[PDB]
Enzyme design. Structure first.
Site, PDB file in Angstrom:
ATOM      1  N   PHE A  70       0.833  -1.202   0.000  1.00 53.21           N
ATOM      2  CA  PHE A  70       0.000   0.000   0.000  1.00 53.21           C
ATOM      3  C   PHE A  70       0.869   1.254   0.000  1.00 53.21           C
ATOM      4  O   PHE A  70       1.754   1.406   0.844  1.00 53.21           O
ATOM      5  CB  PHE A  70      -0.939   0.017   1.212  1.00 53.21           C
ATOM      6  CG  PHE A  70      -1.695   1.308   1.382  1.00 53.21           C
ATOM      7  CD1 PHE A  70      -2.567   1.749   0.397  1.00 53.21           C
ATOM      8  CD2 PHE A  70      -1.537   2.081   2.526  1.00 53.21           C
ATOM      9  CE1 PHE A  70      -3.266   2.936   0.547  1.00 53.21           C
ATOM     10  CE2 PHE A  70      -2.235   3.268   2.682  1.00 53.21           C
ATOM     11  CZ  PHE A  70      -3.101   3.697   1.693  1.00 53.21           C
ATOM     12  N   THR A  91      -2.053  -2.512   6.029  1.00 55.32           N
ATOM     13  CA  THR A  91      -1.933  -2.813   4.576  1.00 55.32           C
ATOM     14  C   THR A  91      -2.506  -4.187   4.281  1.00 55.32           C
ATOM     15  O   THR A  91      -2.301  -5.134   5.044  1.00 55.32           O
ATOM     16  CB  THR A  91      -0.468  -2.784   4.099  1.00 55.32           C
ATOM     17  OG1 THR A  91       0.073  -1.467   4.284  1.00 55.32           O
ATOM     18  CG2 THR A  91      -0.363  -3.181   2.617  1.00 55.32           C
ATOM     19  N   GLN A  92      -3.232  -4.282   3.172  1.00 52.82           N
ATOM     20  CA  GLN A  92      -3.797  -5.545   2.734  1.00 52.82           C
ATOM     21  C   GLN A  92      -3.898  -5.538   1.216  1.00 52.82           C
ATOM     22  O   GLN A  92      -3.285  -4.710   0.538  1.00 52.82           O
ATOM     23  CB  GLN A  92      -5.186  -5.799   3.356  1.00 52.82           C
ATOM     24  CG  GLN A  92      -5.629  -4.855   4.464  1.00 52.82           C
ATOM     25  CD  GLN A  92      -6.264  -3.591   3.916  1.00 52.82           C
ATOM     26  OE1 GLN A  92      -5.613  -2.811   3.221  1.00 52.82           O
ATOM     27  NE2 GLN A  92      -7.543  -3.385   4.224  1.00 52.82           N
ATOM     28  N   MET A 114      -2.112   3.471   7.861  1.00 53.51           N
ATOM     29  CA  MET A 114      -1.602   2.446   6.938  1.00 53.51           C
ATOM     30  C   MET A 114      -2.479   1.190   6.926  1.00 53.51           C
ATOM     31  O   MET A 114      -1.981   0.068   6.810  1.00 53.51           O
ATOM     32  CB  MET A 114      -0.142   2.096   7.263  1.00 53.51           C
ATOM     33  CG  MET A 114       0.823   3.259   7.094  1.00 53.51           C
ATOM     34  SD  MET A 114       0.977   3.806   5.380  1.00 53.51           S
ATOM     35  CE  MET A 114       1.898   2.446   4.665  1.00 53.51           C
TER      36      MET A 114
END
Ligand SMILES: *[B]([O])([O])[C]([C][C]([C])[C])[N]C(=O)[C]([C]C1=[C][C]=[C][C]=[C]1)[N]C(=O)C1=[C]N=[C][C]=N1
Ligand SMILES: [Mg+2]
Ligand SMILES: [Mg+2]
Ligand SMILES: [Mg+2]
Lengths: 222, 212, 231, 195, 235, 244, 240, 233
Positions: free
Chosen positions: A2, H1-2, H107
């Site tokens: 990300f 995050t993923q 995040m």
């Protein structure tokens, strides 16, 4: 993985006059090769005769402006409705930016207004809060296109007086609000021609002792 | 960036350039790389602009609090150590700072401390800091003496920055001069390199390589 | 008597004496009046001085562009509660892009004051507040008591000798409610209302404090020669 | 920093430490004293990562000085070395370890014996007749293995030390700008101003 | 026993009211505000002649443009002064300007009621905070342990306060000069003090726009005392 | 709330005394007498067990004399359970010092540490103090043989000869009378037992009512030996000195 | 945690816990401080109720905070150790950060600040200790003598006494100490300090402790015989 | 995050003279697998707002629950919950925008692109975008994903600037939206034929259309296309 950052393009421009100041910015908003909006306001009236723009990653830009507007509100509450001077606003913004030193607001910030002597003022910031008062500053994507033109046409750099041949410089005569707006419009038209993230529209905020005025001009939409 | 400071008979000379860059892009030619901490303390800035300017501005607040509490001005040693201890707490986080803390007190005399973001704190007579430090060192070391007049010491500092401004791509703009004495610091003007180079070339007979 | 040592103790008749003692601090405070029409809402406050050399203690506090209050009792407690209102008004604006409803603002103050009346160690707030505001449902006036009780009203008054002003407003109810699109006449009615609570002293230029909010009128406070017009 | 040497002779301990401080391509200083007096009869030299070295040395100095005032008594070199080792052994498993190697030269007034301790940043302590940190030992240990005797005088120790420094000045690539030499004996600590 | 934050039947906090009694036992401090500056003066009150009186620090600098005098349990004032100094310097760091005197006073007064069962009791000291800013000019504030602060043209606190305040009532007018104010503080201090007033048992100070906050030397105050004696003997 | 039931264990009286410390000292004054006597060549620790029974297993019992390390021991007067809490803390402190400096802890440093812990309970925390008084007998290479005492206030002092617990006034007078500076361990052993024999509330002083220990340099060459006396060994020294 | 407000105001505006802490100081053994022209002397009383004491190892009344500053006290002995430890830690901390040893005023201000903190913190009682802090500032030859007390107030003194019967010795010092001409030498200063204690002490044997502090970290404690010579000379002059 | 697992494709929208239109197909894709064919990705809030969501479906359902809870919370101690103090599109959007930017700042983003379409109290059209980065913008036409690349060009031919909005009727606007949905079905490999459409008009209110299909498709010309160059048969 990300990526918390993005690039919304755009370009901004601040010019300080003798008794006025302008802060201009294009109204285009983009991601990659697509247009998000042809009119998304980027320069904001923050109160106390101060205008602000935080160009780069729009989410951080909006967050910062929102927090500064908030800071002005609480400055009034805590200090008996005292007017926040442009120099005090600039120092406050440094702390807002440096507060996120290790996870920065990914923006180039410019504020404009009048100093306490009534003279035109422009302050310019890097992403992590380093700032400096300037007579002239372009920011954002097409900053590299516009700044050199402003060094030449606002500060008369590399210009000399005919007949003398490099001996006598061109005198630094002051520029009127009508003269500055011409340079702003030509700066953005030129930037629009050679930079793909610049176009659609130009919005200029003019600051004087009387208050904050707005002017809008069309830019090429390709 | 090129900054220097050196001790001599008439106190301390501090000289800095004015350039700031982002890669090859010249971001500013009018940067104030000397910070007036108080009427007797000066700090120089090299490396990250924000880091230096935030924490040296912060240093002035700590120095002001000291003299309010202790009814006595802070020593150059103590002022420099406040900054070095602070950056040491942040060590590894990625601060980028190369600074001189320059001042005069009765107990110390003229004193210069090199403080940097790795936690290094060094007392010394001469220091040059920044990307163009080596160029400044060349002029400084060959011409330095303890017995220099304020006028000659100032010119040497000015000339050393000019040397680095010429050769170092990431130095330039203009030269800011300061002179620190028993009675405090004294500003000695902004000197544009674009005018100073040709002036020095003609008068000094130097830079014969370049055509003018 | 034996049941007034702390706020966590009911009396045998089901009374909370510490709360009642906090209520008493309001009665000692200087008089302040609140009233409204359909278009505007007005606060009038009699400021109190320590002596002739001293300044007159400020009674009115701004919470937002569309909301503010007047205080009577412990001033520091009014500062804590007004600060809380400022934050709550501000949270509503930043998160929801929404001006905080005056009714909801009252509910938030009620709940904040309540927690201090049921827990050991703390104490009740020692101040009463009159909140005025203009939101999406028009003009509003609230009365806050540190027991937690908040009440929406057309007009009211709190502090020393406040019963006189409250009776006047109860008679004038039908008149001042109709004062729409005329701020000066609504203030006049408020100044005439607070005058019924005066004894010995009269309304001077640095004694009187007025505030107003309305349809096209941000919350603004008038002090000094700005209120000489109404004397 | 670069080179620190130690040698324990009959009645004293001699520490030699380079004067250079280099950052990048510049020698910023050529008169740096890489040592701290922990107590009247105990000296510690140090070398490692910038900042950590001085911070660690002064931290140790403060702790030993605190002990001295509290008890009105000087700790033995062995006791000081054990305290220092524990701090480094504690440090190596920290979030950010002290990247510092030290030599501790002391004169034990109780036993009337000089003592030299070599401790690295991991907390590895050894008592030695002569010691070194970094690339110094790669040169100096062979010389010391040949010449060193346990009954040497202080003057003989200094001559043997000069032979070490001469070898380093011949074969090491870095210009370490000479060394500051200090002697630790029954009378305390003193600096050899001409070397 | 009873709560520390308990209200009396009259609607007052017991502990706050009791701290006010401690302040009445304290040494006298007087402040007078004029258009030319604000003057601050205190009674030192040494408990013994062997006590070096110059070490008695009851007048204190907060910033260049703000000074402070104290009365009561003076040890309690140290953390208040530290907070004031930090607040003043911190605001300069955040806003690149001097902090308003009222804002500084408000910050100090926010500590006052932070007591319960935070600190265990209210402060046992009152403060006279004097200063200057560009907006409201020369100002004098009286900061109490109740968290309340009043602005004053002139104010006396400590043991001889009500007697001094009555005297300040008659003497103060809006056209007072700085010199006139200095003598007036000395006059009233001399009136309420037990021991005879001199340069060693009394201290003067002032705050002006130009020179900022200054504590007066004993030599400078001694002259003003001598000037006072002569002008009183003049009629 | 809870305030109602708080005794307030850490406050001054109007006279400037700490209530709980004073009352803890009153408790200790009813405890079995413990005596410490320091000589030139060693230290003696003697202590009286309180009204024992014939069915008490003496040889495995320990209520008075405890070992802190190889060089330092203590005699207890007061609540035994309170003492064991402090003793275990002191044992740990000694080991912490040994690990840190690689040297045995100096006696005074150990004493100061325990005394500071006691002090803390009198100034903060709102807990009752430890109802214990210690006599510390120890040796180190700085001051040699040392005797100290600490009490619930956390105050400690050094002694040539000292008693704690019951009848200290009578005991201290007797010690002050017969003690001399050039005295030896064997003589100090006799003085300790004679003092207990006169101050005891019991009808007669016997082996089963005593705990005894010595710290001697009487160990093979330059070193120190701790000797906690066994029941039979206490019986023998009682016959030797001529008490039974 | 225990948060109970022990130090609180009473109706007459007094904090009894702080005042009762002063009574603990009143009970403590007498301590005296006298500063000369180029020295400071700290005299301390040792009550002779405790004999069979080991004077080698018994905690001394005067404690070195640093090499140039000393601290004596009157009141609770256990409490004094806590203040002394904190003071010693702060002294080293100051050297570490400021690269200069503490001034006597600074050290006093720190100790006084700790004492004050314990008068308005929850769950703690005030220190039952008053201190005399004496020494010389770094690179300074002007003698310094300060006093602190449980409330946290501190001040400088030409000469001062604290503890039991301090009223009597203060009476002595007030008439015998001249500000225009203080004890010019070490002898004169020590003599005046011993004289002042002899008004209260009882016997001049092992009951008087004297510690002389001079500039540049020159501190020494006088022995029994050295003090006994002062005691002998004073009384022989008195027999007239 | 993923990483997003079950995903929804384009959401498209535009303004017209009296209100706004928004549309999105009913597919929940699992990578290249067209797993779930009955997923509603337009979620109405009151009778004045429709929130269209693309991207991760698990995060969509979370957002759906937040909005449902927002309505419940707004009704608490609110006598004017169905009148003056009802939830506005601007309130709903700003809330989501706050959450999206907060989550990206930790995040741990909500892996979505969101368009809030509605009509305000004063009758003004509301149309604004927000995504996983907390980036926001408004425009006469808005579209997510492939819609941004293919729908916007078509919708901008109808409303190219602000002054074209009053000139655009609901019939013309709906026609353009439906055509855009057909084009996306031709060209987006993670789209479905079935979709939902919602109209929020200041006069006629909220009209929610379910089970719409792409129709009038051109495929006949495919028969004439043979080989990849030279092949004739
Ligand atoms: B100098 O070159 O170190 C200079 C000093 C600083 C106070 C302006 N720093 C910079 O120019 C740095 C980049 C850099 C170049 C060379 C060596 C080290 C660092 N730039 C910035 O800090 C900066 C600040 N604002 C905008 C762009 N760049
Ligand atoms: Mg194009
Ligand atoms: Mg620091
Ligand atoms: Mg090793």
């Amino acid at each position: 993985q990300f990526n918390p950052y993005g690039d919304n393009g755009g370009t901004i421009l601040g010019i300080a006059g003798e008794d006025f100041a302008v802060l201009a910015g294009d109204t285009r908003n983009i991601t990659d090769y697509s247009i998000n909006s042809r009119y998304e306001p980027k320069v904001f009236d923050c109160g106390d005769n101060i205008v602000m723009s935080a160009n780069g990653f729009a989410a951080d830009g909006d967050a910062l402006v929102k927090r500064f507007k908030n800071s002005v509100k609480w400055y009034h509450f805590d200090h008996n409705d005292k007017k926040l001077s442009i120099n005090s606003a600039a120092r406050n913004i440094q702390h807002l930016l440096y507060g996120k030193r290790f996870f920065p607001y990914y923006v180039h910030t410019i504020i404009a207004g009048l100093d306490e002597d009534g003279k035109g003022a422009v302050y310019s910031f890097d992403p992590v809060g380093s700032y400096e008062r300037e007579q002239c500053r372009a920011g954002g994507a097409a900053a590299s296109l516009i700044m050199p033109f402003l060094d030449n046409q606002v500060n008369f750099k590399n210009q000399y007086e005919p007949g003398t041949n490099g001996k006598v410089k061109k005198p630094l005569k002051y520029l009127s609000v009508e003269e500055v707006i011409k340079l702003v419009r030509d700066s953005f038209t030129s930037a629009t021609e050679r930079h793909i993230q610049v176009g659609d529209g130009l919005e200029i905020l003019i600051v004087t002792k009387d208050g904050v005025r707005k002017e809008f001009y069309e830019l090429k939409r390709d | 960036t090129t900054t220097l400071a050196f001790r001599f008979q008439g106190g301390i000379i501090v000289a800095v350039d004015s350039r700031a860059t982002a890669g090859n892009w010249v971001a500013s030619q009018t940067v104030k790389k000397v910070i007036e901490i108080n009427p007797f303390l000066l700090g120089t800035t090299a490396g990250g602009a924000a880091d230096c300017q935030f924490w040296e501005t912060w240093l002035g607040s700590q120095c002001r609090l000291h003299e309010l509490r202790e009814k006595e001005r802070i020593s150059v040693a103590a002022a420099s150590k406040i900054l070095s201890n602070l950056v040491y707490q942040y060590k590894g986080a990625g601060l980028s700072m190369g600074t001189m803390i320059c001042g005069y007190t009765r107990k110390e005399g003229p004193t210069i401390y090199y403080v940097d973001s790795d936690g290094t704190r060094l007392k010394g007579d001469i220091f040059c800091v920044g990307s163009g430090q080596t160029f400044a060192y060349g002029v400084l070391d060959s011409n330095y003496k303890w017995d220099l007049s304020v006028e000659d010491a100032l010119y040497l500092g000015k000339r050393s920055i000019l040397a680095a401004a010429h050769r170092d791509a990431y130095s330039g703009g203009s030269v800011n001069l300061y002179h620190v004495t028993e009675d405090g610091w004294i500003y000695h003007g902004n000197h544009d390199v674009g005018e100073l180079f040709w002036k020095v070339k003609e008068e000094e007979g130097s830079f014969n390589n370049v055509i003018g | 008597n034996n049941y007034d040592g702390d706020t966590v103790t009911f009396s045998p008749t089901g009374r909370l004496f510490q709360v009642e003692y906090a209520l008493e601090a309001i009665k000692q405070g200087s008089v302040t009046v609140g009233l409204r029409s359909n278009t505007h809402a007005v606060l009038v406050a009699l400021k109190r001085n320590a002596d002739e050399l001293s300044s007159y203690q400020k009674k009115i506090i701004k919470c937002d562009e569309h909301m503010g209050l007047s205080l009577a009792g412990l001033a520091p407690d009014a500062r804590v509660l007004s600060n809380y209102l400022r934050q709550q008004c501000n949270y509503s604006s930043l998160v929801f892009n929404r001006k905080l409803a005056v009714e909801r603002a009252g509910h938030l103050l009620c709940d904040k004051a309540q927690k201090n009346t049921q827990s050991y160690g703390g104490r009740p707030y020692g101040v009463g507040l009159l909140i005025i505001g203009y939101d999406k449902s028009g003009a509003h006036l609230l009365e806050f008591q540190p027991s937690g009780n908040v009440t929406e009203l057309y007009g009211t008054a709190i502090g020393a000798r406040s019963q006189g002003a409250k009776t006047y407003l109860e008679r004038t109810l039908d008149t001042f409610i109709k004062i729409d699109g005329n701020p000066d006449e609504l203030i006049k009615a408020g100044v005439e209302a607070i005058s019924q609570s005066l004894r010995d002293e009269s309304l001077t230029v640095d004694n009187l404090s007025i505030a107003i909010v309305g349809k096209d009128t941000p919350f603004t406070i008038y002090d000094g020669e700005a209120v000489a017009k109404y004397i | 920093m670069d080179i620190i040497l130690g040698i324990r002779v009959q009645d004293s301990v001699i520490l030699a430490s380079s004067k250079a401080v280099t950052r990048g391509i510049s020698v910023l200083k050529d008169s740096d004293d890489k040592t701290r007096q922990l107590s009247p009869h105990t000296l510690m030299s140090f070398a490692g990562e910038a900042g950590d070295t001085v911070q660690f040395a002064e931290y140790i100095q403060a702790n030993i000085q605190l002990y001295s005032i509290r008890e009105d008594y000087e700790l033995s070199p062995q006791a000081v070395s054990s305290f220092v080792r524990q701090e480094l052994a504690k440090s190596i498993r920290s979030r950010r370890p002290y990247q510092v190697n030290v030599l501790i030269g002391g004169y034990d007034k109780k036993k009337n014996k000089p003592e030299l301790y070599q401790i690295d940043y991991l907390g590895t302590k050894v008592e030695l007749p002569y010691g070194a940190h970094g690339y110094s030992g790669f040169y100096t240990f062979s010389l010391l293995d040949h010449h060193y005797r346990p009954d040497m005088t202080t003057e003989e120790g200094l001559d043997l030390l000069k032979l070490c420094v001469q070898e380093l000045e011949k074969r090491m690539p870095m210009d370490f700008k000479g060394v500051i030499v200090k002697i630790v004996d029954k009378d305390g600590i003193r600096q050899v101003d001409d070397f | 026993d009873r709560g520390v934050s308990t209200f009396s039947p009259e609607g007052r906090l017991f502990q706050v009211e009791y701290s006010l009694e401690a302040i009445k036992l304290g040494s006298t401090a007087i402040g007078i505000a004029t258009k030319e500056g604000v003057v601050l003066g205190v009674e030192k009150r040494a408990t013994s002649p062997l006590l070096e009186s110059d070490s008695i620090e009851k007048i204190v600098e907060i910033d260049r443009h703000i000074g402070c005098a104290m009365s009561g349990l003076t040890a309690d004032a140290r953390s208040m002064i530290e907070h004031a100094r930090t607040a003043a310097v911190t605001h300069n760091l955040y806003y690149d300007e001097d902090i308003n005197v009222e804002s500084l006073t408000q910050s100090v007064c926010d500590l006052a009621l932070r007591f319960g069962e935070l600190m265990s009791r209210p402060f046992g000291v009152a403060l006279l905070i004097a200063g200057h800013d560009a907006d409201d000019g020369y100002q004098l504030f009286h900061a109490e342990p109740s968290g309340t602060f009043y602005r004053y043209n002139a104010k006396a606190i400590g043991s001889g306060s009500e007697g001094a305040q009555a005297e300040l009532l008659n003497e103060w007018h809006s056209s007072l000069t700085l010199k006139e104010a200095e003598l007036l503080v000395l006059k009233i201090l001399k009136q309420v003090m037990e021991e005879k007033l001199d340069e060693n048992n009394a201290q003067l100070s002032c705050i002006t726009k130009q020179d900022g906050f200054k504590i007066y030397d004993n030599e400078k105050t001694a002259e003003l005392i001598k000037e006072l004696k002569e002008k009183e003997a003049a009629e | 709330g809870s305030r109602r039931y708080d005794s307030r264990t850490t406050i001054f009286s109007p006279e400037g005394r700490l209530y709980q410390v004073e009352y803890a000292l009153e408790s200790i004054s009813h405890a079995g007498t413990a005596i410490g006597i320091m000589a030139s060549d060693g230290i003696v620790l003697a202590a009286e067990r309180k009204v024992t029974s014939t069915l008490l297993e003496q040889d495995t019992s320990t209520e008075k004399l405890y070992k802190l390390n190889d060089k330092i021991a203590v005699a207890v007067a007061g609540l035994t359970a309170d003492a064991e809490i402090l003793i275990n803390t002191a044992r740990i402190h000694a080991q912490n010092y040994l690990k840190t400096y690689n040297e045995d802890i100096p006696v005074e440093i150990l004493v100061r540490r325990l005394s500071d812990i006691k002090q803390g309970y009198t100034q903060h925390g709102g807990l009752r103090p430890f109802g214990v008084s210690f006599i510390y007998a120890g040796y180190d290479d700085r001051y040699g043989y040392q005797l100290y005492t600490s009490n619930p206030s956390g105050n400690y002092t050094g002694w040539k000869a000292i008693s704690v617990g019951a009848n200290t006034s009578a005991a201290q007078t007797l010690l002050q009378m017969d003690y001399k500076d050039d005295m030896k361990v064997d003589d100090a052993i006799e003085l300790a037992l004679k003092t207990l024999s006169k101050t005891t509330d019991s009808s007669a002083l016997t082996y089963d009512r005593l705990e005894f220990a010595t710290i001697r340099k009487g160990a093979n060459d330059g070193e120190v030996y701790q000797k906690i006396f066994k029941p039979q060994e206490i019986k023998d020294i009682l016959v030797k000195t001529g008490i039974t | 945690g225990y948060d109970r407000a022990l130090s609180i105001f009473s109706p007459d505006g007094h904090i009894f816990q702080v005042e009762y802490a002063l009574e603990a100081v009143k009970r403590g053994t007498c301590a005296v401080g006298v500063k000369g022209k180029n020295c400071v002397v700290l005299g301390c009383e040792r009550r002779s109720t405790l004999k069979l004491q080991d004077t080698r190892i018994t905690p001394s009344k005067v404690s070195k905070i640093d090499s140039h500053v000393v601290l004596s006290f009157s009141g609770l002995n256990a409490d004094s150790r806590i203040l002394i430890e904190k003071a010693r830690v702060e002294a080293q901390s100051h050297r570490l950060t400021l690269e200069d040893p503490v001034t006597v005023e600074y050290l006093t201000r720190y100790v006084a600040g700790v004492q004050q903190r314990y008068t308005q913190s929850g769950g703690v009682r005030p220190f039952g200790v008053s201190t005399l802090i004496a020494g010389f500032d770094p690179r300074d030859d002007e003698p310094k003598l300060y006093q602190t007390e449980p409330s946290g107030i501190y001040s400088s003194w030409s000469a001062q006494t604290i503890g039991r019967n301090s009223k009597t010795v203060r009476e002595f010092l007030e008439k015998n100490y001249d500000r225009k001409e203080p004890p010019a030498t070490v002898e004169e200063c020590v003599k005046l300090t011993v004289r002042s204690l002899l008004e209260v002490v009882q016997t001049g044997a092992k009951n008087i402790e004297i510690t002389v502090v001079k500039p540049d970290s020159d501190i020494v404690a006088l022995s029994s015989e050295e003090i006994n010579q002062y005691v002998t000379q004073i009384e022989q002059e008195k027999q007239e | 995050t993923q990483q997003p697992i079950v995903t929804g494709t384009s959401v498209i929208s535009m303004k017209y003279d009296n209100g706004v239109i928004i549309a999105a197909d009913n597919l929940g894709s699992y990578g290249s697998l067209l797993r779930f064919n009955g997923v509603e990705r337009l979620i109405p809030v009151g009778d004045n707002t429709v929130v269209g969501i693309s991207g991760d479906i698990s995060d969509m359902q979370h957002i759906e629950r937040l909005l449902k809870d927002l309505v419940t919370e707004n009704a608490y101690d609110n006598p004017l919950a169905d009148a003056e103090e009802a939830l506005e599109p601007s309130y709903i959007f700003e809330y989501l925008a706050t959450v999206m930017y907060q989550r990206r700042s930790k995040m741990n983003p909500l892996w979505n692109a969101i368009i809030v379409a509605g009509v305000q109290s004063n009758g003004d059209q509301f149309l604004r975008y927000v995504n996983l980065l907390g980036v926001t913008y408004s425009s006469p036409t808005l579209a997510t994903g492939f819609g941004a690349h293919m729908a916007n060009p078509l919708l901008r031919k109808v409303v190219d600037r602000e002054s074209d909005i009053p000139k655009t009727t609901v019939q013309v606007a709906e026609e353009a939206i439906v055509n855009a949905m057909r084009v996306l079905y031709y060209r987006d490999a993670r789209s479905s034929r079935n979709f939902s459409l919602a109209i929020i008009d200041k006069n006629t209110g909220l009209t929610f259309k379910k089970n719409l299909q792409v129709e009038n498709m051109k495929w006949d010309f495919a028969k004439d296309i043979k080989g990849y160059g030279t092949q004739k048969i």
